[PDB]
Each structure stands twice: as C-alpha cells, then as structure tokens.
Nucleic acid binder design. Structure first.
Lengths: 138, 311, 214, 214, 138, 138
RNA sequence: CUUCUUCAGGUUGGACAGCUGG
C-alpha cells in the first residue's frame, strides 16, 4: 500500500502530487541533448512501457490474491528490461525515468510482491502521463 | 453490387513495412562474421536473466553501443539456443548497422502486410483526378481491402538504402525487408457502381506510366545509365501490373502531382513543396535502389507485381 | 421452445469494435476496443453482431438495396430481429448476447496479449507529411464462443429461419464485424456452429443442425 | 406454513432495467438503470422479475403460445402469480421482492463500479450515417441474492408448484431480464436455489430442494 | 459548505449563480483554437470526468461521516488526475477547466478532506453542466 | 407576497388568473421546433422540477419562520439549476419556463428569501399545472 | 541529414401511458 519514489507514495494522495512535482521540475529545466542543443520529451517515447504496464495491470486486476504470480513477476522483469532498452535508445527517456524515479518504482514493486503495490505504481504511471500531457505533451 | 477479388502480390524487389524501430544491438544479436542477425525470444530472455546473472547487472550497460554479440558470447561466454525466434540475412552494401527497422508483425511474430497499406497503394492510383475528394469521396468508402495472409519467416532480409545521384552512396539506415520472389495473398472487394476492376487496372497503368516515362526513364536519361548496369532491369509497359508498396518506394509514389501536371510544372511544384520540408542545397530527387548477392544486383525498392482474379 | 444457436467467432484479422476512450487506464491507446468492465476481456457486443447480421441479411433479402428503416425490412428479417411497428409489434426470435474473449489460456501460453496495438498513419498527396495514428485491435486467432437463443414462435417457418441465420452468418464471412473493416480489420470466421434444445428435446433438430453446420 | 426461496441472480451480460431518468442528478447517463433510492444500489424490481417469469412460464405451460390477458392464464399460473377476475380471485402464492445487488464489495475488489456505460449507434440506412447513443448497464458478474416467499396453501400441489417455479427459473436463463435483451443485454443465471421454511419445519422440504436444484 | 475559487467564493447557496456566470463568460468569449477557430466544449469531452465524479458521489453519499475515508480521497485524487489528463489531451477542454474552477474546487475538496465540501463540489459541477447545456449544449 | 413574474407581479388574489392566462397563451400558437412544431410540453418533462418544488414546499411548510433558512435556499437554488438544466435539454421546456416564468419567480423567491414568497410561488406553480391540465394534459 | 503521436464527421430518434374490480 506504499512504495518509495524517494519520499513517499500513498494511495489517498500524493500519487499525483509527486507527478505534479516531477513534471514541473522537468519543465523547470528540460533535458540537454547536447551542449549546443535544446531538447524536449515526446510522449511517443514512453508508449512501449505504457503498453506493457497496461497489459500487466489487465492481467493482475483479475486476481483474488495479494502476491503476484511468477508469470506476472516475469512480466515486471520484462517491464524493467524494456525500460532499460527504451531509455538507452534515446537518452532523454533516460532523463525522464531518472527524474521520475520510475525504475525505482519498478524495483519497489518487485520487492514488495503485492498486488496493491503494482496498482499504486500503475496509478503513478497514469499520473505521470496525465501531468506530462497537461503541462507539456506533444 | 459488391464483387470480391482475391489478390496475389509478388514483391519484385524488397518491400518493407515498419512496425517498430530498434537502435544498436539491444533487442537482437548480430554476428558480423556470418552476416546473420538473430532476434532474441524476449520472454525467454527475461526468464534466462532471472535464472542467471542479475537483470540490474545486464541493464547497467545500456549507454549506446553495447552490442549483444559482445555480451552474450564475449563477456558472459554463453550460448543462445533459446534466445532466437527468427534469423535475417544482412546486406552491408560502409555505414555500419547502426539502426534496424523491423518489419510489422502481428502478436505471434508472423510478418504480414498490415491494413490500409494496400488501401493507400490503391488510393495513389485511383485518386489520379483531384486532391480535393479524399474523405467524403465515396469511391474508397466502398473499397474494402483485407490484411495479408500467412508469410514464412524465412522470407525476410536486411537491406541498406542505395542512392542514384551520380553514384550509389551507402546510407546508415538499415531496414528489414521481405526478399524478392515471395508470394503474398490479399482480398479486395468493392461496389460495382463506384469502382470496377478495369478502373483499378487503368489507374495502376496510368500511375506506372507517369512513374516510368516521366520519372524513372526521364530521370535515368537525365542523370546516368551505366551506373545501373548491376542488373537494374526495371521492366515497363506490363499491362499496368505493377504497384509500389512498402517503405523506401520513393517520394514520387507518395504524391500525386506528376500524373496531373506536365514535366516542368510538376518538377517545380515538387521542388517548392519539398524545400519547405527539407533544407538541402541539392537537385531533383533520385532513385532508391539496393544491393543483394556475389554481385550488386540492383533491385527497385518497393517494386511489387500486382495480379488480380475474380472472387 | 428455446433452441440455442452455439458456435465460435474466430478473428482472421485484427478486430476493432470501438469502445470508449474514457473509462480505462490513463495513457492507454487513443482508440481502444470495447471490453468487459469486470474481467477487462475484449468483448463482441451482442448489439453490434445483431446489427451487422441484420444489415447484411436485409441487404441480401432486398437484392442489395437498403435505404429503408429497420421496421420496413422483409418479413423473415422482422420476425428474426423484431419490430416496433405501430400496426403489429413482432417479438424477436433471435436473442443475441455479449461475447467475451474465450481463448485467453492459449493466448497466454503462446505469449501474446489479447489485444495488439496497430501502427497507422495518413499521408497527404499534396505534401509528403504522414500524420501518426494509434489504433487498438484484438489480435487475430482470438476465439469468441457465443450463444444465440432462438424462439420457436412457429414450427413451420423454422427451417427457413435457420437458413436465413446461416446465410447471415456466411455474409459476415465475406465482410467485417466492427470498426475499420474498410482497411482490413475485423475479419471473422464462424466455426463449430450447432443448434441445441434448451429444455427437453426437439424433433427434426438434426435437420436444423445439418443446414447450420454446412 | 410459509416458504422462502433463496438464490442468486448472476449477470452473464450487462443488465438494464429502465430507470426514472428524472431524479438521477444532473449530467448523468442518458438512460439510467433503476437503483435503490437510499443506497444508490442498482436493483432488480420484484415486479419486473415476476412479470418476465410469469410471461415465460405462462407461454411454456399453456401450449408454447400465449396471447390471452394475464387473468386468463392456466390454473397453475393463476395460483402462483394471482388473479383479479370477478368471481375467481386467486391469492398469489409467490411474493416477489426488490433485489438489490449484494457483491458491491466483490466488484470494488476489481476496482470497477457496479454500473458501466454502453456506447451504441444506429446507422441510418439511406444515409449511411451513425447516430451514437449511451446507455447504462449493470456490469456482468454482478450478483443479486433474492428472496421469494411461497404461501404453502395446498399440500397436494406444492411439488407441482415448485416444479413450475424451477421451470420458470430455467426459462429465464434462456431469455433476458429487462432492457435491450435481444441486443446482447439482460442475460442472467440462477444458482444456490434453495427453499427453506419461514417458521417451523416442512416434512417435504428435502424433495422441494432437489427439484429446485435439478 | 464553502469552496474557494481565488478572488471569488462559492457556498452552498450561490453555487448555481457562479456556475451560470462561469458558463456565460465562456459563451461570451468562446475559446479560439490555433487556426483562428472558435470551439465549444461537448458533454462527451468531459463525460469520463463527470462519471468519475458521480461514481465517488454515490459512495460518499452512502457515508454519514464528516471525514472522507482514505479510499474515497484516493478516488477523488484520481479524479483530479483524470481532469488534468483530459485537459492535456484537448486544448478546448483545458480552456473549459481553466475558465471554470474544476481544478481549484477539486483541490479544495482534497484540502478540506470533509464530506460536505465534496457534496458542494458535486453541486457546483452539476450546476456547471446544467448551465452549459442551458446556453450552448452539446 | 408581490411575487415578480418579470412583466407583471402576482399576489394572493392574482396567481390563478395569470396562471390560467399563461396556460391559455400556451395553447394559442404553441411551440414550434426546427421541423415546424408542433407538440406541447408533458408532465413527464418537468416532473423532476415539480418533485423538487414539492419537496421544498414540504420543507418550508413545516417551518414557522418568516425567513427561509440557508438549507432551504440551497434547495431553491438547486431547483433553479435544474430548471436551467431541462430548459437547455429540450426547447419545448425552455419556452414553457420562459412564458410561464418559473425562473423569474424562483429568482424573486431567492431575493425575498421569505416563507410567504415561496408559498405564493408554490401556489402559482400548482395553479399553473392545474390549468395546464384540463386544457392540455399528458 | 526530416517532422508530424492523430486530424476530420456524426452527439439519441420514434412508440406506449394507466386500464380493469369493489
């Protein structure tokens, strides 16, 4: 019922307020692609991870149990692998995952081994998408 | 009335339709010696990672470069029987295999020509009259094309873009393509009042004629002839039996202004509309061939042989 | 009684029966498919299948002409699919049901999701610009076991009704079920068709099952 | 002697019993379902379940056809559902009740509300233009535990009465309960059908349970 | 019993007048798109937000507790996240949210944490729907 | 008393005559749609408004105070909000409210804020419905 | 070496409305 972005992650609140703050900080100083360059993130570079997270959410919502099964754990491992791949592809997804502690959320969900942990992680992912589209987007 | 028409497509050259793009080797293995590329079964890949060296250790090294060839066999020294789904030969014919555009596939990994691809390839012919009637045009609202059927995984290959401007310059873009001489099955239907088979054939023939005598042959007699000849046969006047489907077909195949205006007007219109898109101090567009074994067999990119039959 | 027309809908190509973009996870595909609210399984609405089958059968029973209201169709169409006419209201003999995805175990063991994300774009001919498009479709090979209830209002006109039902099922074969069927999506293939008696037993049911399976 | 018929109604597909559509706040769905006023819980009215069960049972019991007024049904239908004739007033042996859904906690476990919104359109045939609409449905998987009171008036026909009751429940399982049933909605199922004695004991309650369970 | 908007205030009695003036301001100065195009918001555009508001209204009203529960507040925070997402998706929806005070009212409901504040928020959104359909409609 | 109906006021000796006159003017040259009319309003089109008015009348009639409480003024404000809702939901109700000034009477009650003003409004509404029937109906 | 992550169009219509008995 709680994972670690670095400070706290409660179901009741601040699962979207921390998305507020992460997106505001990203807009506060956007990533620098190169010394003589200007860069801004596009939501098309998160889409694979979003698809994987949504698929795992659909798989886990139909479970009357707390701990995620072994196949779901392999799916979360795949989610982390895809995070690494799509972060290494364009090194602005690297900045996006670093400043949002998204990989840290993945690791916390893996450690907790609880359904509500992944549900709150998915809620934070939805908050990140929502507040990125709100302030920025494109 | 609605009449169905089974459609068979044979790609004279390589045809590429994308479904995703991958950077340097992270999701696939490339043995540079044997010119063979292996795509890792990713779920078995993560199961193997869970069974062996830690996933964090594996993913701590994704900082560009980092080919899987020099990690699975060099840094770990392990064999990869389960980490394969299909193999694709590679055509390196001096810019390295930096990027690989994979062919579009369904959930099970089978390649297939997706929806709206053949629809656009037919719109680029039937739309010969005007650019206005596009959405409300009832011509294509009654045209009904289907998806491709089963395609063997063995019929895939990796090709590099080749140029025509005064030479054949290799390009860093490498893409996954179906090899030539591959049979593809489709199914197209349409209302008789709005469209007819002879109308489709006439549109295809007119498009190919304006492509060949005005652009292909015209651009050949304006740039060079002996550069193509390795083979570069490029047959023409084949009863309008040619359609260009897939990526790398050319900028001409995606725009309808050479077949609605004469040479000078269409040339100047293309130059003006493309200089807005791209800022290059260059000249008219050039062909986009490729090479394949060994000789440099020049094949026209996206060249497909389109034949139809009743029902 | 309540003859049950059973079978299976097999997706030859991807199917996109349009669900609401809302009422789902934030950040999902722009155009999603309709799903069961509880199980999140892809759904073939009974209303969509009924409407497509009625449109195809009424067109085929009117020599390929349909410019009239649904209540002004053929007598067989009106008796199978019901009518709201002021003069006489015909209770529909066919009762369609929402069809859930059924072969999720085999899709799980083949390591494929229930839905695939399709990559599409539209390119102008005046300008070589292609607008990206995101469309969700249920993957091909997805089975959909259904159960259509049939009413024996009259025993004389049951073989004709089931012949019309088979004709409607076969018309869906050479057509799409829902969504962007113009562009290759939604191809279906009925299989394992059969008719059973809900309560007790019905004579000459073998004749109906013979004209329904082939 | 009085008997209580326990059981659960499970929604196989979405159910839509038409609501008031004049008091469900402002900016709600176009066509709401009927709900309990206090708890805002969707319910199956006893009147609607009774009417559907009576129609199906009277149609199946008489000849398979039913065209008469409700007061001119068979003796079994009149003794089970009551009659208001002049000189033949049958007191109904069955007392139906409004059925609120009970598994709201189970539905909230899957993070889904009790009711969904179903998007439908009608395509005008002469124009080929769609007309989207929205309706509200109680989602499939909702459970409605009901209670029906049986007045044990004649000991000589309680077995036949309960055979008719089981038959009516079976007929409801091959039909729909309220709403756009022919268009995929309203399919229900019955299980845990057990009859218990309201006060005291019934010496043939074991035979009643086995005909109510099979 | 009293939700904040900024300079102006909304109570249990003046919610309708404030919703009416907010709607009238929108119709008097309709939102202009990028290509010089005036646009009017549709009920279907905010239908998901409205149903989320009504979904948690049903569970709030079946609770005789002054303080909102943790899960109810989680639902309300998710509603605010969805409001932000829909604002980021459509510029006209974002303009409608900004001209009204859906974000301000929802965050004041999160601040007050009380049952009556959310009920007045639901009253305000109902009045906004009513006056939106009164003038322009779908 | 002295309830303002926009043009001419009503009081305890007037409301029935003006209600009958408004209803008769409803039947003379009735509402016209975009497609040339030609239906009139029905009871099950303002039934919700009538039920709200009945509930508020029951609440007020059990209070002896000359001034309406804020808890009842909230109910009258919601009545006005709903009247705006079905007025915009269908134009057959909009002109019915306009010509038989429900909104003007509600505003005058919400301004006077007195028990007698709302009682006069309720009597006027009852007479309006009574004359709407026996002349039209449905 | 190139940018677009979706744009455009529909947004509910018709029917029934209380009838029998004391």
């Amino acid at each position: 019922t709680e994972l670690k972005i670095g400070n706290e992650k409660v179901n009741s609140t601040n699962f979207g307020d921390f998305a507020e703050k992460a997106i505001r900080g990203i807009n506060h100083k956007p990533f620098v692609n190169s010394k003589g360059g200007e860069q801004k993130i596009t939501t098309s570079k998160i889409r694979g991870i979003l698809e994987l997270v949504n698929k795992v959410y659909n798989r886990v919502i139909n479970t009357n149990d707390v701990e995620l099964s072994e196949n779901i754990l392999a799916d979360i491992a795949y989610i982390k692998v895809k995070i690494a791949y799509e972060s290494g592809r364009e090194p602005v997804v690297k900045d996006f995952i670093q400043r949002t502690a998204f990989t840290a959320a993945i690791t916390d969900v893996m450690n907790q081994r609880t359904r509500e942990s992944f549900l709150l992680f998915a809620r934070y992912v939805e908050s990140l998408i929502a507040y990125f589209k709100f302030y920025g987007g494109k | 009335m609605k009449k169905t028409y089974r459609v068979t497509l044979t790609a004279l050259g390589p045809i590429f339709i994308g479904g995703g793009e991958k950077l340097k080797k992270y999701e696939y293995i490339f043995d540079k010696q044997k010119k063979v590329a292996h795509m890792i079964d990713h779920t078995k890949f993560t199961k193997y990672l869970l069974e062996k060296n830690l996933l964090d250790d594996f993913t701590s090294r994704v900082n560009s470069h980092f080919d899987l060839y020099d990690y699975l066999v060099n840094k770990k020294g392990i064999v990869f029987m389960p980490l394969v789904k299909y193999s694709v030969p590679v055509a390196q014919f001096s810019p390295p295999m930096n990027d690989l555009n994979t062919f579009v596939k369904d959930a099970f990994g089978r390649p297939y020509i997706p929806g709206s691809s053949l629809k656009g390839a037919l719109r680029t012919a039937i739309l010969n009259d005007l650019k206005e009637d596009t959405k409300e045009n009832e011509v294509f609202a009654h045209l009904q094309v289907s998806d491709s059927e089963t395609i063997d995984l063995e019929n895939l290959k990796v090709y590099q873009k080749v140029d025509y401007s005064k030479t054949a310059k290799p390009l860093p873009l490498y893409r996954e393509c179906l090899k030539p001489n591959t049979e593809i099955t489709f199914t197209v239907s349409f209302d008789d009042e709005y469209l007819t088979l002879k109308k489709i054939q006439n549109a295809l023939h007119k498009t190919y004629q304006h492509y060949y005598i005005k652009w292909l042959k015209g651009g050949k007699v304006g740039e060079t002839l002996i550069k193509g000849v390795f083979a570069l046969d490029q047959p023409s006047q084949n009863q309008g039996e040619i359609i260009y489907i897939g990526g790398g077909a050319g900028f001409v195949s995606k725009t309808l202004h050479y077949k609605s205006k004469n040479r000078d007007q269409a040339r100047n219109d293309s130059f003006d509309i493309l200089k807005q898109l791209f800022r290059t101090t260059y000249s008219k567009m050039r062909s986009v061939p490729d090479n394949v074994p060994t000789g440099k067999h020049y094949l026209e990119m996206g060249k497909a042989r389109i034949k139809l039959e009743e029902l | 009684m309540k003859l049950v027309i059973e079978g299976t809908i097999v997706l030859k190509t991807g199917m996109h029966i349009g669900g609401s973009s809302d009422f789902s996870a934030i950040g999902a595909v722009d155009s999603p498919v309709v799903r069961d609210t509880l199980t999140r399984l892809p759904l073939i609405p009974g209303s969509s299948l009924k409407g497509k089958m009625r449109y195809l059968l009424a067109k085929e029973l009117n020599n390929g002409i349909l410019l009239n209201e649904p209540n002004n169709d053929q007598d067989e169409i009106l008796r199978l699919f019901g009518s709201s006419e002021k003069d006489k209201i015909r209770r529909a003999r066919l009762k369609f049901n929402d069809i859930k995805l059924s072969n999720l175990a085999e899709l799980e063991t083949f390591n494929v999701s229930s839905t695939e994300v399709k990559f599409e774009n539209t390119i102008n001919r005046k300008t070589a610009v292609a607008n990206p498009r995101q469309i969700e479709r249920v993957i091909a090979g997805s089975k959909f076991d259904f159960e259509i209830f049939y009413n024996l209002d009259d025993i004389k006109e049951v073989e004709k009704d089931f012949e019309n039902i088979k004709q409607g099922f076969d018309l869906l074969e050479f057509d799409y079920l829902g969504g962007h069927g113009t562009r290759g999506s939604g191809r279906i293939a009925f299989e394992n068709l059969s008719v059973i008696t809900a309560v007790g037993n019905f004579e000459k049911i073998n004749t109906l099952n013979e004209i329904l399976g082939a």
